[PDB]
Amino acid sequence: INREDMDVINPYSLEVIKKIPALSREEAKEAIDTAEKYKEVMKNLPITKRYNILMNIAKQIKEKKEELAKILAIDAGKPIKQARVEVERSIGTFKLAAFYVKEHRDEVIPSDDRLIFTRREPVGIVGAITPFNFPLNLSAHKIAPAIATGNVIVHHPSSKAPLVCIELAKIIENALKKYNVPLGVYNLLTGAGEVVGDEIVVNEKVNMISFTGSSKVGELITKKAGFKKIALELGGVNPNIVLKDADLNKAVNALIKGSFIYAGQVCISVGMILVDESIADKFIEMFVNKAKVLNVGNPLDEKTDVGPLISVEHAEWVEKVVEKAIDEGGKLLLGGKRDKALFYPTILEVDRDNILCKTETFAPVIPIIRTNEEEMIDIANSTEYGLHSAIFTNDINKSLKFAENLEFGGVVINDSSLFRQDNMPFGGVKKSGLGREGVKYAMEEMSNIKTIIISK
Amino acid sequence: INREDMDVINPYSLEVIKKIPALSREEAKEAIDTAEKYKEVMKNLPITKRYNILMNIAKQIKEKKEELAKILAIDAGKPIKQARVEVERSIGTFKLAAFYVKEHRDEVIPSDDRLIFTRREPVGIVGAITPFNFPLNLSAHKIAPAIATGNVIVHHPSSKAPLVCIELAKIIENALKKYNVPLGVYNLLTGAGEVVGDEIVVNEKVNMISFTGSSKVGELITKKAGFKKIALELGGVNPNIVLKDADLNKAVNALIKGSFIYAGQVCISVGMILVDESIADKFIEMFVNKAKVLNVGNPLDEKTDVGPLISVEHAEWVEKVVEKAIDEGGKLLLGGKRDKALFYPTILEVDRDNILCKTETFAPVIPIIRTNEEEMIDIANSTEYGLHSAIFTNDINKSLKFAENLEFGGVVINDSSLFRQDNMPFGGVKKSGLGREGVKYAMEEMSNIKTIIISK
Amino acid sequence: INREDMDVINPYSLEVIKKIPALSREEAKEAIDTAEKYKEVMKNLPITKRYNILMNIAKQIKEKKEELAKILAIDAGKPIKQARVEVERSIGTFKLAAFYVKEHRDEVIPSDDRLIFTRREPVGIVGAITPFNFPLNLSAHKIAPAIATGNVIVHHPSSKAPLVCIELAKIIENALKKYNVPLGVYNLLTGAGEVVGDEIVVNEKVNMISFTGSSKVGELITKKAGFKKIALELGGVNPNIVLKDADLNKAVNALIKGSFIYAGQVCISVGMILVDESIADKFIEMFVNKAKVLNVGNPLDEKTDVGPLISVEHAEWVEKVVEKAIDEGGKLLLGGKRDKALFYPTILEVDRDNILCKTETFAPVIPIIRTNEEEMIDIANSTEYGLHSAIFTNDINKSLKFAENLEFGGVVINDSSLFRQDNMPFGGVKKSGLGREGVKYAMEEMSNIKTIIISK
Amino acid sequence: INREDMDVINPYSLEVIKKIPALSREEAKEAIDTAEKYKEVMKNLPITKRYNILMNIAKQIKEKKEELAKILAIDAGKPIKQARVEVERSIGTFKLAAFYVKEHRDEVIPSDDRLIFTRREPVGIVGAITPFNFPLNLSAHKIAPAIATGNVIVHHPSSKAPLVCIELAKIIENALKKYNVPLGVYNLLTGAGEVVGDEIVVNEKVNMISFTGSSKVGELITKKAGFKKIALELGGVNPNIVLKDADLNKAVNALIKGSFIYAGQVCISVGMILVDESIADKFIEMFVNKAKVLNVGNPLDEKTDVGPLISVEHAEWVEKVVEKAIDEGGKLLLGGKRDKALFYPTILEVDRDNILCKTETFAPVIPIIRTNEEEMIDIANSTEYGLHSAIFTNDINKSLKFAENLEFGGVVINDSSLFRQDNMPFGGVKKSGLGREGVKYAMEEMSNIKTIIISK
């Protein structure tokens, strides 16, 4: 059904881009029932066919790279340079799934009178729910491994930037036609998250939820999901630590990127910077000065470093948080300033009890805490989250100690928390999530082991 | 605690053996708080120390081998020969965790100008909840891997057979003291499961739930657990299939064991036998005849093949399921007899619709269905469960088709469903559970991955 | 160089296609010296660059697929349809090496106070020596993983079919130029194998020999290589076994392929067929009838099933072996006819004492033995070689017994010895070789482990 | 036999301890011939029996712990405390092999129409050749995995310290008797290395040579082994690098151990120390001072740090090596003296051209070169060997640069080259050897892969 129910916004011009369908809970149910009927076909789809489909998707994404990046610029406000990077990553993500279909290993276990070996089989229907920020690559990170493991897919992309997922869905439709697979094996269900996304969570016919998005929606999902496999990638306030012996020049450059890439709207964005008291002044000055020269505006402009936040309503919320932060004694050093949703790089020096140390802002808003080395781990671990952390030092013993004691799914050394190599296992501890993504790792999540025992 | 609150019953004689402590919900909360204070100590315990603790536990179990078996016989009603086997496997389980502490591999991922490697760290507190039927070995399968991965443990054992677990708790305590580790890293919480175990399920301080028991409680745990890792080993109505080309004597011997070991009170016991039409009379004759001459009586007697069911309550209820199955057209071929808790081997021929095809009796009750080959997979797959299945044939092509199409965590070829090699990955699909046990596989559930990235 | 020293022959027409350089021992020494200068550049070449180079080779091969297949037909005498298949396989090989550059995993070993991890580094100079029969894909199986593991290469191709390798060298040259890697990291050295190949084997600057070819030369290499890692893939008389219970139609069809693909000039070609006495007459009848209607002639012709042998001199030798087999009591069932190098499908019935049971002819000559089952393994195991074996049966227990007892690098059930899946470990035991190929496995051979120990 | 052919010497007192058999070439031939008769038996020994044999060996070694240690002191000259540590490691080695017989995994490879899996099978007869320095643990590292993988063993132990290998052979014979395995599966062959060892190398019935000893004999083997798998663990001159930012106290302590443990007679003993010139005098002073107070004397005395070298003849050669090093301009800082075979801790300051930089002395003789950081990698890499290297620094980037660029099988950071954890892959590159040991790795060398393909 192609109706026109819901407004899609250009976050920069605030103009309506187009209208798209918004499914009702009842239509979401129907879509799931239909998807269930195709389980047997996906389960039995030969390896070669899975490989071919995945390769073809990567091929289409490549051929439409520039179109897709423009779409990311317009719909998600993603600076075109960063947008081309997201697209190239989606290419690699589908490509890597194709090869894991061919290369995935099972095991044989020794036995005196038995041949015991394992087999991986699909969990069945994979319910994928993706966010606005990297909607192409994050969708690739769910779709590619779901297809690689013989799963049927119902997918709800973020209403905040659904257009690239719509183009990917058509790309997927295209590859399925090419290799004679009914189109019902993948299903893009657009609409209101608390309706269409929620139906996916609750519906007893979905076998696994793979969710990337807000902490609050994540935590709800654990309570509503029921008897399903659950994978969650939520946010964090990602602490990046700069010890006195850090290469300051490189630490600043790395932290400018980790702070302000996609206007700080990344689950692994710099959330707080903890800097040794003895170098704090020199760091703050260099950091502030490099952030001063960032070009802030139209994501379609090649020269643009930082574009708008996803909506006016979030920008307005961030403005409040920044106000609350100054009230608690935060010292504003840059920005704290917005035109509509275009939020300027904002830097504050705060203490450890600040609101910004407990709040993921999804914004180019960076709190710097000057501290002694002995307090750093305490402060770093003091949140409810545990996604990514980073440390800048040249000291072996200190780096080993911090790396072991930081309670996070990822610890980055001499680069910001923002780092993610796509083929690495990735995810959080504590309230930051459940399970690991990265194609090989997601494949293991999106399948069940069958143990086969042959008695001799 | 010195309290003597809750009767423990000998299922054969129905006598009280003694009274153990029954903790309140408050006492469970308080015990969980205590365990939290030792998280850092368990987390930082060196490999050599976890190895030593684990090996010393195995050593103490070996020394007390015969006593512990007697306790299984008296408390769980397990025939003494079968109890000795359970004890032996629990020894193997603790020694195997000890070796995996030292051998468990992490990985390095290639990268230009980055060193990327993984590290497993404990989930924190592991709440372990275990059943009555294999309380020593099933405890071992949660405790041993939890210790190997540096977790603190709160453990609730089944009230129906707790005494062996209390002896294991004393063994663990000795081990901990011997190697100067505080005793609060391991906690045994006895009392009512729906209070004490429920608190373990529900407490926000528990990081992971590992549950083995009933499906009713399993499903309820998925809704109550919330933000924790969840591993479930629930039951099943395990289908055992005998094709026309099977070795009959060997199939009968295998299925006798699968049906009657521990009086059918095993999550992987034979739930139904499906036998080809052309060999059905020969099979049923031979099968019934072997069942006849099994010694029913005192678990303490070396001669006993079948002992009592775990409670009178459950046995009376079993007798009701039999009468109902006869009333649906079930043909009784053996037994149906019962003295108090002691339930005699009972075999019936039924159709695919009989209540027994959909009920996990946990009793020595075996429904046998004759049918064509083309209908076997449908019947086997027709349930809500997916723990273990078994197929008896010499046909390569048929064995492969069945192994691929049987919707189960385990498929056994030319032995019954009741097979489990301890070092194999083990668990169910559908309503039969989540995640896999076996020390190596449980260790990966009971730890979280940390990805460490060094920028070169 | 640009010299025209050595005839290259069309095996079908016996005409000189062209003349290629024949390097002296001094010239091969020089190329090896030059290759040595580039070890550090290859050793330090980034993952990204190696992946690009490997993918670019695959891409150029794909674009010249037909030209390359035609060279194989004209030069190696390979039927055009089979030549297309080799080309296609060679593409997959380079592609899979590219992925393994990005994905190959190292390990971390637990230690009390140390970080212990591994790192793979090139052996240095890989000396690759390849055969006439699959010169493109077998070269790929040496070059692709050599490049993936940061080795410099010296490669001697067979003088019997060098042209496609000279085309592959130009392809490699193009990929190197495109990514700014010096040309001397790969060196094709043509000429007399006993001069040039021998120099690769003998020269102390070569770190590793990877040889595929004849037993006589392989065995010599083990005595002449000295201090280098050695990998050998020699031939064998590959026994294929047909039990009484086999699907005869599938067996015949499979065996026709394994017998007559590339006129039996493959290392894993069918060497003998052992057939149960009870089904022998029917198997022989069928096999002979299918082999009659094979189209024998010009490999450039789409119609041709079987083309000529690699040289007259070899065809002449086979004829004598066949005449010797007939003198020993062999019964001619088909063929035995020769036209220059074009040898016709030849089938004989023999006993185990017949010379053909002990001789790898590299020819479409198939000896059949009728025997009883319990003699089959003994006959199969009776040679000095042990590359591949096959067994056709629908019996689980027999297939398991035969799989375990066959002293072979590979055991194929229900297809002929000729099966090789490129991504599988491949190689032989006894005099059939040392080490395994298939890209992942070859990478392990062409690198050395470095264990790195960081004391905390 | 009961023959008394060969004097066994106590290297401290120079007394004959006893005479033992010296086999002739002919008797070595017969022992290999008998060994061959047992290939099938070993190859078919079930997992459980291999496990039981291995653990029973470990157990006997533990019960005879102190005895074996005194033997090591009396026969090998090994100080008693270091002898205990060698015994304790050998125990672990046999235990770990037992673990791996049960736990070693094979793989399954995906395929559209095939089930493809691997199986390891014994190489056949393993020829083990061991040295004098760790005759018990190094034997364990060859025998334990050889039993694990189903091989027959013929084993020549060093004539310089055979007594403990004789005791181990009896322990093995005991283990074999207990579980009804013929004694012929393991054969200890004493006598001249150039006769008995050589026949093991040359004999065509031996399938694999695992050799640990001198580079000169190792090099020989590579020319004489013929068509067998070859694994060599030779020595080297192991460079240990001390950077200006190193913890000097820790470096000194680590380097005293690495230099003087077992009087420098370990294949991974410190062969040279490279120290930054800005810290040379401080390091040299502290190092010489610590070396001064070591107790040199009788290995049986508990106080003894350094016992004698293995023979007067070797001690006399070392004396001449030291004089040559002084003649070339080396500055003697300590020692350079001997009392028969007792050689005192000897330390010299030399330049990079000194004979000590190129010679493995197997003696407590330590050359120190003061240099600049940027020449250190060149000097470390400038020998023909490549076993172990070490670097002392607290600088992350430098440790990584050195770790990557040091051409060695092992790199130790912040401990000396002597470090070996028994469960880590261990071995050298360049002339330091081939293949890796550590039980799990040795198992892979001492077995062949078999690929089994089932067509569906």
From Swiss-Prot, chains A, B, C, D:
InterPro entries with a match to the protein in the record: Ald_DH/histidinol_DH (IPR016161), Ald_DH_C (IPR016163), Ald_DH_N (IPR016162), Aldehyde_DH_dom (IPR015590), ALDH-related_metabolic_enz (IPR051020), Lactaldehyde_DH (IPR053404)
pH dependence: Optimum pH is 9. The activity remained constant to pH 10.0. Below pH 9, the activity gradually declined, and the enzyme was inactive at pH 6 or below.
E.C. designation(s): 1.2.1.22
SUPFAM superfamilies: ALDH-like (SSF53720)
Pathway: Cofactor biosynthesis; coenzyme F420 biosynthesis
A Pfam family: Aldedh
Amino-acid positions noted as binding NAD(+) in the UniProt annotation, renumbered to this chain: G213, S214, S215, K216, V217, G218
Assigned keywords, A-Z: NAD, Oxidoreductase
Catalysis: reaction(s): (S)-lactaldehyde + NAD(+) + H2O = (S)-lactate + NADH + 2 H(+)
Catalytic machinery residues: E233, C267
A GO molecular-function descriptor: lactaldehyde dehydrogenase (NAD+) activity
CDD domains registered for this protein in UniProt: ALDH_F21_LactADH-like (cd07094)
Function per UniProt: Involved in F420 biosynthesis through the oxidation of lactaldehyde to lactate. The substrate preference order is propionaldehyde > DL-lactaldehyde, DL-glyceraldehyde > crotonaldehyde > glycolaldehyde > acetaldehyde, acrolein > formaldehyde. No activity was observed towards methylglyoxal or glyceraldehyde-3-phosphate. Has a preference for NAD over NADP.
Subunit structure as annotated in this protein's UniProt entry: Homotetramer.
Similarity section: Belongs to the aldehyde dehydrogenase family.
Protein name (record): Lactaldehyde dehydrogenase
Annotated source species: Methanocaldococcus jannaschii (strain ATCC 43067 / DSM 2661 / JAL-1 / JCM 10045 / NBRC 100440) (Methanococcus jannaschii)
